[PDB]
From a paper:
ATP-dependent chaperonin TRiC/CCT partners with cochaperones prefoldin (PFD) and phosducin-like proteins (PhLPs) to facilitate folding of essential eukaryotic proteins. The ring-shaped chaperonin TCP-1 ring complex (TRiC, also called CCT) is a ~1 MDa hetero-oligomeric complex that has a double-chamber architecture, with each octameric ring formed by subunits CCT1-81–3. TRiC-mediated protein folding depends on an ATP-driven conformational cycle, which regulates the opening and closing of a built-in lid over the central chamber of each ring.
Briefly, human PFD-bound actin remains in a high protease K sensitive unstructured state. We used PFD-actin to generate a TRiC-substrate complex followed by the addition of PhLP2A and subsequent incubation with ATP/AlFx (Fig. 6a(i)). CryoEM analyses revealed most TRiC particles adopted the closed state, with ~42% of the particles containing extra-density attributable to PhLP2A or actin encapsulated in each different chamber. Further classification revealed clear actin and PhLP2A density each occupying two opposite chambers. In the closed TRiC chamber, we identified completely folded actin which indicates overall that unstructured actin was transferred from PFD to TRiC and then subsequently folded by TRiC and PhLP2A upon ATP hydrolysis. Notably, both PhLP2A and actin interact with the positively charged wall hemisphere comprised of residues in CCT 3/6/8. SD1 and SD2 bind through large surface contact with the CCT1/3/6 wall, while SD3 and SD4 extend towards the center of the chamber without direct TRiC interactions. However, the presence of substrate caused a dramatic change in the NTD H2 to cross the inter-chamber cavity and stretch towards actin. More importantly, in the presence of substrate, the NTD H1 helix was resolved and shown to be in the trans-chamber making direct contact with folded actin (Fig. 6b(ii), c, e, Supplementary Fig. 8f, g, Supplementary Movie 4). The cleft between actin SD1 and SD3 contains a hydrophobic groove which is the site that binds the amphipathic helix H1 of PhLP2A.
Residue numbers in the entry:
A (entry chain M): 13 to 536
B (entry chain P): 51 to 399
C (entry chain Q): 9 to 210
D (entry chain O): 5 to 525
E (entry chain J): 2 to 77
F (entry chain S): 8 to 33, 48 to 375
Write the structure that this text describes.
């Protein structure tokens, strides 16, 4: 029979199926994993790249790198999705998990050319991940963190900042992050929402200026620029309505059938204005916190009333001011009273000198709930780098809200889990030892790339460290992270999360098990 | 016969063995072909079944005509020849009438009568379709009026084999009720033709508010008047409400307060046939009707029919005035073929 | 209907085009049919010897004129038949015929080393060609005395010269390799050099 | 002369077309010849907008596929009929159809008429259905716990030939506890799923109460308490915001005092609704309609929850869960109309905030929180679990089950060929071809598993010649065993529908004579 | 190990990458271009340049300090 | 008579002409005798009685029609079939009212008229495809299949380019220098006709116009100033697409089109999928086509394909359609002539059958 159109438009129709499809998968994925090699964990470099609109953004936060790429193949987009998942889960190993996946699929492509069904490889990977995570949970040590002891957390954040340029100062950021978490944490619920923190940065200055402010920052100046600029401890109020006379949200046609109606309205207008002034002056609050702006009459009246206020303040910043001040929300002067007012610690105006920006800070004497973080640096690249790094640090601390959320990292965990996997796998029948050994190899991939990134003679480094940590068992003998000898990690103390590595292992295992199954392809 | 899959210029795949449906699908540009196809069209209009018989008869007549006129005959004499033969057939065919159908009422009688025309269609088993069509048609047997094809409806449902199909005395529709209750038996039906919201006057109506109390009482009095109207409707003892116009939620909430079934249809045909089968009336106002102008039904349900949900109006007496057939088939084209076979059977009846 | 109304108004569909190409081609096909009879009396030079099947009338003006032009053509072409034997000049004189060989006369400058059936057959073909075209200067010699220590793996190399300018080249047997090479193919190649006008199948 | 029809037609007929039909069908089947069976394979198709998709139940992919051919479209429609009827095995039904057409090639080439062919299919399918019903599986238990156990076994079967075969027990008990918690109404709108990035399969969880995505909230949010050991819910179909009244209520007053009175009175309506809500004693106010900022400010002052413009599905699920009742006007709230819960809080789960309700006595609905690593993976899981739900809903009516491993085709073919002995003529020929088309299936399953079938097929014949039942093929061991004791059970209604529709389509396709293309104006 | 181009096209149109010393060379060539563009003007006896737009009235502004210079130019 | 009462104009030529000879602005011979001077200046005084797509006055239309082709077109319509335009939508009342006046004062033999959308579709060379009738004051959806407009398928939406300009000047107060006067309305419209393009979407366009500020275009105009950062330009199309910008929060126009297509049978939508041409009236700038394409592609199943068609000039499109239909050579089968006008009056126009 002459060939005939069965499938709609088979002319532009491209099909791939079989082992060659797996070959395409493995080659693309190995290329990507090797692309994303040189930023591993505690010590690495940063890859710089520009996107379509011409923006320079460089980091080792691998999820951003993978997200800002106009890649072509599907598996790479899947990798980007996995990176985003891991970043939104912990925030570290954003390249570790992808390199691990690349290693697993290296092992998969090696064993594939040996003629075995991919189900076997996926099953082996799943069992090995089970064993690895089980031992990783056996080896992590519980950290007793209270409200008055912070040194373990300080070293945790300090180690976390490795390979992240913010390790310039490397000390103050840990302290300010811990203080911010303590101030804002909801202890009983174990909950910390990051919408409570206004992560802000301004170019210039130095990384020494990286500070935590126990209050709120606002970026609007005086309604009357001539009005006195700074006030000490004060009382604020939050009004969600402008100073305009009350007009309803229904279309209204107010007739004026008489001249005395005109006089009545032109008198009632001001009467309402000064009535509002008297209302707000009675309650005694120093400050007014509005959202929609208002008319200049209120400005001059407050000039004659000496009562500071601001306007056009946005929604979330309004809410944060209310949270920090301890008061409640006053929709209109009916709810206005001296009770629901919010007490101020001190409020002041800065302009950053040479700049023409204006920015008010609120620092509270009494207890606060919403803190603010400010950044000073070299450029917008510096600002964004500090922002993302500290944000990942906050995620780390939020994970660290509980105990036993830390195990010795820096690659030592990789050796330990590889050893456990090999030990368990050896006592098994055939058809499985190969896949489990492959997973083990994928496990010691991480220290190999680590030593490469450090520039250390790799193979001898891993050999000696493995011998040292095999002959005597401990979770602290990892390779040099500070590159100064002292590989016993009970001295350097790489202090990094447990669930981060566990989630990386789980994500990599599930993702490789998934990719192993796509054996028949179709493109246009 | 053998089915002829044809694709129209509109890209609808017609799997047709009905010569009438075939020609409807066929696009021909020979004027004599247009003559013949329209002749078959009017033939199917008058009778319906076996339109291809007319085609073959005309073809045989025309080939014999070509033969005789190639022999050397002239037009007229042979024209009268055919006409005399035709009138001879006109008189002699009635002499060949062998039997006459009787009473059109016994179920197996009409089943056997219609299975002849059905047999020209699908051959595997006509007697099952014969049983179904007989059950449908005899149930609505007019006494002094006139049998109509609109008195029978059709319900195709994609699903299992055709053997899992039956007939329904009533109507079925592809809708789901907004009523929090689902199943009512011996429900009292209040059919409505007016829009279900507050009756909107045909001219621009404007609310004029001067004092505060006007606003204060506005919504309250509005909802209370709405409640008064719906309560007056409820006082008739109705258990379902049928309307076609735009619906208002306040009415639905009130019906919830009274546990009232609410159904909204979408076709004027639906309302007309429902009133025909239940005896209700198209009420131009929401005001409750009298017992005489309403329709009464044995049971109404929202019954699931195979992972497809439909509103069903069923009369347990199965008298009604209109009956529909539930259909289960693996493809739409099978539905079309069986539907046209049933069309042939019903035209036969 | 609608399409042609479109055609009066717009040109959005093309369907009335390209119906002039075959028209013009057929016009030229019918036109070119008179060339057979246009030069019937203008080609053959034996028509006088073709009496009693070529004569209908003699105007004695253009036809005697045709004899006059024909005899001028014949004397011009037969005054040049001076060759027909490929000749062996020596390398000492070589400068005097690479340059002083006459302007307007093609020179087939053949160089060879005798002994291989390649060169022998090529020499045979050119010598036989000399019997046909005695208006072409053939030159044969030993390349060793023409070019000192010339590479013997580069023979037979055909040279086409006129006024010291190389017009055609055929170097080594890489373009003549094979005993199957024949008379007419050599004549074809030398015609392709632009010296001869003849016809061959391939 | 003048041509009969319009230009652009095509007219090919005879055995040429008949053969040319069958072949087409064959193509499609071999495209998906490896999916079903507890081995399981996965495809990938990217089209148009670039949306990739992955599945191993062929109906979905073929829907994603776009094809134009009467045979091809007929295959698509019969596959969708199987899909909507019961569910899984659509791969198997299309494979069976292609096996029918391939088995009867020579008869098409030989001398045989479609009447005998089609009546042979009809008789064979009638007998197959009779055999199925006569030897159908009954448990003789009629117990709730044994019902749930069989449901879990069949759910694992449904996850066999799927992607999550490792977690089959986990999701199986999960969905069984979901369904047995529901009524016997078979409503499928009420078990919606809220999908989440990150996390593994065991991290995915089923909520006894209601979890829905916390929508956009205005300023002043999060001030409300985030924990209630016994709150009360106020479902609303009413809108709370300072707006126009009816878009036509025109003011025409001339005294500014009345103007301010009107404004203050609109505020009075607002605060009236607020007070009416407050006197209800409830703490959870939800809404399908927008809620103004002032309402949430009042609630923060009144120390209670707020949520508006939520999709209707969410409020209806909430109504079915908490046992409350949706209101439309604030003027008729009672002590029993409102919703009641045992614990309500908003939680942070893998990068988002959801609203959670638990402890409700009225356990009649549930929602799934899916934790996955891939959107492709997540949607494959959702469709597989939907398949499991469908299987459970079909089975709870009656334990019309069939064991897995494709042995069922061996019982079918055994019965057909054993029957195909007394019948004379080509009827027996057609029944034998019909039996071999069935016989093919588990060889299709196991050769994909990577080992010979011929010897084990002979062993199947031997085992079933004397009364062996469902002695199917081992999957990761490449052997033979009884799937009824291997506890991979598919619904019988699946296979009955499968073979009935297969006979339908076969007789339909055999029953065409020609085709006519039209110009496509 | 370093290889991200040999296996398959992992990039759409106009998407590329450079891993080895090529990337360093590109960056340093740009940097030295910047420096010579600016080091020709530093010092109390530093020098001056002219910034000219491409079309659109040819915006003319004389400047010694390199700030506006690096603002105007399209760096790549 | 190829006269066509357009949106505001009436254009008089012939069917065979390439264009109408005279225009309708709502001293050629005015220095010889002056007979037509008075008539034409009087007709000039009368205004356009059509607004929003519905006829509003009747005496003036016949008043103008009498003169407009009795004093310059020089035609006796008694010896001519008649082909005019009409407002985009009207009930049968206006049609059967216009028939009465036409016959009773002209008694012309035959007639036929059609909706402007059909004329535009013919001018573009299509008999199929729904056109987005984004007319002034109000927009409408007319899905045309084979030529006849479906009475059950016309949707009307109140959006207008006037409304877009007004909303711009409602967010131009936020720009500092607002614009409200006649001159300021004119300059807002001028800037809109200069640049209000669409790239993809609101937020991403605003980011690239404010974060990098590379979408800025300085306004060096006598009536303009550099006050646009690339925001206001793109701020005109956005409310064209997203209703909540204007404050009237409802569904998108794409939703209306999608429903008006889905309510019909799926098969015919394929033909509607085929062309799906557009029309101006409020849209003149590119970026519309691909943006609405992808926006409705979100609403369009990936299994089916969609096409976008938009000619650059559509000014005499109704006239082109009229000229084509006047030469269709089958439209006379649908002429309504005296043979039915004097037999049934307006009843057949009402379609008493069906």
């Amino acid at each position: 029979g002459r060939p005939f159109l069965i499938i709609k438009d088979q002319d532009r129709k491209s099909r791939l199926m079989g082992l060659e499809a797996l070959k395409s998968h493995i080659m693309a994925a190995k290329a990507v994993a090797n692309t994303m090699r040189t930023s591993l964990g505690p010590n690495g470099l940063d890859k710089m790249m520009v996107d379509k609109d011409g923006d320079v953004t460089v980091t080792n936060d691998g999820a951003t790198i993978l997200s800002m790429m106009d890649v072509d193949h599907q598996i790479a987009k899947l990798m980007v999705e996995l990176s985003k998942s891991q970043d939104d889960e912990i925030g570290d190993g954003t390249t570790g998990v992808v390199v691990l996946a690349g290693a697993l699929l290296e092992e998969a492509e090696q064993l594939l050319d040996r003629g075995i069904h991919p189900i076997r490889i996926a099953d082996g990977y799943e069992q090995a991940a089970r064993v690895a995570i089980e031992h990783l949970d056996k080896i992590s040590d519980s950290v007793l963190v209270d409200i008055k002891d912070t040194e373990p957390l300080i070293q945790t954040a300090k180690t976390t900042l490795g390979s992240k340029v913010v390790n310039s100062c490397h000390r103050q950021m840990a302290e300010i992050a811990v203080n911010a978490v303590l101030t804002v944490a909801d202890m009983e619920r174990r909950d910390v929402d990051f919408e409570l923190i206004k992560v802000e940065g301004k170019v210039g200055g130095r990384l020494e200026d990286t500070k935590l402010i126990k209050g709120v920052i606002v970026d609007k100046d005086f309604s009357h620029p001539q009005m006195p600029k700074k006030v000490e401890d004060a009382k604020i109020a939050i009004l969600t309505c402008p100073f305009e006379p009350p007009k309803p949200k229904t279309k209204h046609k107010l007739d004026v059938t008489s001249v005395e109606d005109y006089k009545a309205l032109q008198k009632y207008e001001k009467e309402k204005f000064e009535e509002m002034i008297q209302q707000i002056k009675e309650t005694g609050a120093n400050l007014a916190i509005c959202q929609w702006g208002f008319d200049d009459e209120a400005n001059h009246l407050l000039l004659q009333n000496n009562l500071p206020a601001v306007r056009w303040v946005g929604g979330p910043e309004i809410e944060l001011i209310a949270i920090a001040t301890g008061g409640r929300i006053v929709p209109r002067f009916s709810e206005l009273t001296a009770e629901k007012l919010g007490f101020a610690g001190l409020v002041q105006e800065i302009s950053f000198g040479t700049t023409k920006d204006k920015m008010l800070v609120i620092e509270q004497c009494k207890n606060s709930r919403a803190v603010t973080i400010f950044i000073r640096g070299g450029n917008k690249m510096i600002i964004e780098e500090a922002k993302r790094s500290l944000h990942d640090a906050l995620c780390v601390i939020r994970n660290l809200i509980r105990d036993n959320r830390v195990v010795y990292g820096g690659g030592a965990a990789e050796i330990s889990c590889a050893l456990a996997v090999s030990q368990e796998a050896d006592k098994c029948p055939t058809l499985e030892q190969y896949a489990m050994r492959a997973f083990a190899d994928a496990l010691e991939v991480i220290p190999m790339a680590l030593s490469e990134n450090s520039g250390m003679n790799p193979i001898q480094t891993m050999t000696e460290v493995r011998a040292r940590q095999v002959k005597e068992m401990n979770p602290a003998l990892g390779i040099d992270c500070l590159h100064k000898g002292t590989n016993d990690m009970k001295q350097q103390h790489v202090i990094e999360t447990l669930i981060g590595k566990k989630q990386q292992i789980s994500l990599a295992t599930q993702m490789v098990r998934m990719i192993l199954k796509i054996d028949d392809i179709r493109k246009p | 016969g053998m089915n002829k899959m044809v694709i129209n210029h509109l890209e609808k795949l017609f799997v047709t063995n009905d010569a009438a449906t075939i020609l409807r699908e066929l696009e021909v540009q020979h004027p004599a072909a247009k003559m013949i196809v329209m002749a078959s069209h009017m033939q199917e209009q008058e009778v319906g079944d076996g339109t291809n018989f007319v085609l073959v008869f005309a073809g045989a007549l025309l080939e014999l005509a070509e033969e005789l006129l190639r022999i050397g005959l002239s037009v007229s004499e042979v024209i009268e020849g055919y006409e005399i033969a035709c009138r001879k057939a006109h008189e002699i065919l009635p002499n060949l009438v062998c039997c006459s159908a009787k009473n059109l009422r016994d179920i197996d009688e009409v089943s056997s009568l219609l299975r002849t025309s059905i047999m020209s269609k699908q051959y595997g088993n006509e007697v099952f379709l014969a049983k179904l069509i007989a059950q449908a048609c005899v149930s609505i047997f007019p006494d002094s009026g006139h049998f109509n094809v609109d008195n029978i409806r059709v319900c195709k449902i994609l699903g299992s084999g055709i053997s899992s199909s039956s007939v329904l005395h009533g109507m079925v529709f592809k809708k789901e009720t907004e009523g929090d209750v689902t199943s009512v038996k011996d429900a009292k039906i209040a059919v409505y033709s007016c829009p279900f919201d507050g009756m909107i006057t045909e001219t621009k109506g404007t609310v004029l508010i001067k004092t505060a109390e006007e606003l204060m009482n506005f919504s309250k009095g509005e909802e209370n008047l709405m409640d008064a109207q719906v309560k007056a409707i409820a006082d008739t003892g109705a258990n379902v409400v049928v309307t076609g116009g735009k619906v208002a939620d306040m009415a639905l909430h009130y019906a919830n307060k009274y546990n009232i079934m609410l159904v909204r249809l979408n076709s004027k045909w639906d309302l007309r046939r429902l009133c025909k089968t239940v005896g209700a009336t198209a009420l131009p106002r929401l005001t409750p009707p009298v017992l005489e102008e309403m329709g009464h039904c044995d049971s109404v349900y929202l019954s699931e029919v195979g992972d497809t949900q439909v509103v069903v109006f069923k009369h347990e007496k199965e008298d009604g005035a209109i009956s529909t057939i539930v259909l289960r088939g693996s493809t739409d084209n099978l539905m079309d073929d069986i539907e046209r076979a049933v069309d042939d059977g019903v035209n036969t009846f | 209907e609608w399409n042609d109304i479109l055609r009066k108004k717009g040109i959005l569909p093309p369907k009335e085009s390209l119906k002039e190409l075959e028209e013009e081609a057929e016009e030229e096909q019918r036109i070119l049919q008179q060339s057979v009879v246009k030069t019937y009396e203008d080609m053959t030079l034996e028509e006088l010897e073709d009496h009693e099947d070529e004569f209908n009338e003699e105007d004695e003006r253009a036809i005697e004129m045709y004899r006059r032009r024909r005899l001028a053509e014949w004397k011009a072409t037969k005054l040049k038949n001076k060759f027909g034997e490929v000749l062996e000049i020596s390398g000492k004189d070589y400068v005097q015929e690479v340059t002083k060989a006459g302007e307007g006369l093609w020179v087939i400058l053949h160089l060879y080393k005798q002994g291989i059936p390649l060169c022998a057959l090529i020499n045979q073909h050119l010598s036989g060609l000399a019997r046909k075209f005695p208006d072409v200067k053939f030159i044969k010699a030993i390349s060793t005395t023409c070019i000192p220590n010339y590479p013997d793996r580069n023979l037979p190399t055909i040279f086409v010269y006129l006024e010291g300018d190389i017009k055609a080249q055929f170097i080594g047997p890489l373009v003549f390799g094979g005993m199957n090479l024949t008379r007419d193919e050599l004549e074809w190649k030398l015609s392709e050099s632009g010296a001869i006008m003849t016809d061959l199948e391939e | 002369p003048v041509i009969l029809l319009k230009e652009g037609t095509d007219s090919s007929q005879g055995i040429p077309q008949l053969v040319s039909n069958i072949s087409a069908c064959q193509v499609i089947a071999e495209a998906v010849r490896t999916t079903l069976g507890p081995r399981g394979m996965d495809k990938l198709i990217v089209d148009g907008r670039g949306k990739a998709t992955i599945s191993n139940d062929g109906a979905t992919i073929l829907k994603l596929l776009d094809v134009v051919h009467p045979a091809a479209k007929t295959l698509v429609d019969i596959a969708k009929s199987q899909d909507a009827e019961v569910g899984d095995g659509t791969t198997s039904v299309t494979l069976l159809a292609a096996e029918f057409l391939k088995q009867v090639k020579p008869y098409v080439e030989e001398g045989l008429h479609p009447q005998i062919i089609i009546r042979a299919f009809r008789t064979a399918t009638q007998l197959a259905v009779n055999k199925i019903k006569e030897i159908a599986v009954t448990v003789k238990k009629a117990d709730k716990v044994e019902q749930r156990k069989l449901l879990e076994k069949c759910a694992m079967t449904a996850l066999s030939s799927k992607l999550i075969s490792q977690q089959k027990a986990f999701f199986a008990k999960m969905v069984v506890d979901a369904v047995m918690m529901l009524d016997d109404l078979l409503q499928l709108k009420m078990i919606g799923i809220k999908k989440v990035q990150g996390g593994a399969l065991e991290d995915s969880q089923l909520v006894a109460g209601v979890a829905f995505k916390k929508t956009f909230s205005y300023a002043g949010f999060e001030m409300q308490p985030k924990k209630y050991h016994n709150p009360k819910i106020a479902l609303l179909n009413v809108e709370l915001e300072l707006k126009a009244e009816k878009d036509n209520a025109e003011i025409r007053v001339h005294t500014v005092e009345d103007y301010q009175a009107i404004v203050d009175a609109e505020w009075n309506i607002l605060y009236d609704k607020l007070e009416k809500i407050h006197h209800s004693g409830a703490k959870v106010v939800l809404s399908k309609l927008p809620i103004g900022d002032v309402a949430t400010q009042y609630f923060a002052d009144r120390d209670m929850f707020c949520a508006g413009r939520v999709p209707e599905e969410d409020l209806k699920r909430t109504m079915m869960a908490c046992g409350g009742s949706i209101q439309t006007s604030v003027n008729a709230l009672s002590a029993d109309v409102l919703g009641r819960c045992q614990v309500f809080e908003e939680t942070q789960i893998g990068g988002e905030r959801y609203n959670f309700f638990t402890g409700c006595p009225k356990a009649k609905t549930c929602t799934f929180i899916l934790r996955g690593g891939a959107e492709q993976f997540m949607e494959e899981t959702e469709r597989s679990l939907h398949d499991a739900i469908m299987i459970v809903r079909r089975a709870i009516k009656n334990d019309s089950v069939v064991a897995g491993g494709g042995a069922i085709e061996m019982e079918l073919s055994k019965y057909l060929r054993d029957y195909s002995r007394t019948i004379p003529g080509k009827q027996q020929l057609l029944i034998g071809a019909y039996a071999k088309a069935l016989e093919i299936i588990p060889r299709q399953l196991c050769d994909n598993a990577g080992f010979d079938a011929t010897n084990i097929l002979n062993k199947l014949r031997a085992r079933h010649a004397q009364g062996g039942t469902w002695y199917g093929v081992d999957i990761n061991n490449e052997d033979i065993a009884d799937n009824f004791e291997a506890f991979v059970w598919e619904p019988a209604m699946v296979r009955i529908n499968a073979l009935t529709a297969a006979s339908e389509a076969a007789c339909l396709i055999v029953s065409v004579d020609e085709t006519i293309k039209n110009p496509r104006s | 190990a370093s290889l991200s181009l040999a296996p398959v096209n992992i990039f759409k149109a106009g998407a590329d990458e450079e891993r080895a010393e090529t990337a360093r060379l590109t960056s340093f060539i740009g940097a030295i271009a910047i420096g010579d563009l600016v080091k020709s003007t530093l010092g109390p006896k530093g020098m001056d340049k002219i910034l000219l737009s491409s079309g659109r009235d040819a915006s003319l502004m004389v400047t010694n300090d390199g700030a506006t210079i690096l603002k105007n130019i399209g760096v790549d | 008579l190829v006269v066509d009462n357009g949106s505001g104009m009436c254009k008089a030529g012939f069917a065979g002409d390439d264009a109408p000879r005279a225009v309708f602005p709502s001293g050629q011979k005015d220095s010889y005798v002056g007979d037509e001077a008075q008539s034409k200046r009087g007709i000039l005084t009368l205004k356009y009685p059509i607004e929003h797509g519905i006829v509003t006055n009747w005496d003036d239309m016949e008043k103008i029609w009498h003169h407009t082709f009795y004093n310059e077109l020089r035609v006796a319509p008694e010896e001519h079939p008649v082909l005019l335009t009409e407002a985009p939508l009207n009930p049968k009342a206006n049609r059967e009212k216009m028939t009465q006046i036409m016959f009773e004062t002209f008694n012309t033999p035959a007639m036929y008229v059609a909706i402007q959308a059909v004329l535009s579709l013919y001018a573009s060379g299509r008999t199929t495809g729904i056109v987005m009738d984004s007319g002034d004051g109000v927009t409408h959806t007319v899905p045309i299949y084979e030529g006849y407009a479906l009475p059950h398928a016309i949707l009307r939406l109140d959006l207008a380019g006037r409304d877009l300009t007004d909303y711009l000047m409602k967010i131009l107060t936020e720009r500092g220098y607002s614009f409200t006067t006649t001159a300021e309305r004119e300059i807002v419209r001028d800037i809109k006709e200069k640049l209000c393009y669409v790239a993809l979407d609101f937020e991403q366009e605003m980011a690239t116009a404010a974060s990098s500020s590379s979408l800025e275009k300085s306004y060096e105009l006598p009536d303009g100033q550099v006050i646009t950062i690339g925001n206001e330009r793109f701020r005109c199309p956005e409310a064209l697409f997203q209703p909540s910008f204007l404050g009237m929060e409802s569904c998108g126009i794409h939703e209306t089109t999608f429903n008006s297509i889905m309510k019909c049978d799926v098969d015919i939508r394929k033909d509607l999928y085929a062309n799906t041409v557009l029309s101006g009236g409020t849209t003149m700038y590119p970026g519309i086509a691909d943006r609405m394409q992808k926006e409705i592609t979100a609403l369009a199943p990936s299994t089916m394909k969609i096409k976008i068609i938009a000619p650059p000039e559509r000014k005499y499109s109704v006239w082109i359609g009229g000229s084509i239909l006047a030469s269709l050579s089958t439209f006379q089968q649908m002429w309504i002539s005296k043979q039915e006008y004097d037999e049934s009056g307006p009843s057949i126009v009402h379609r008493k059958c069906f």
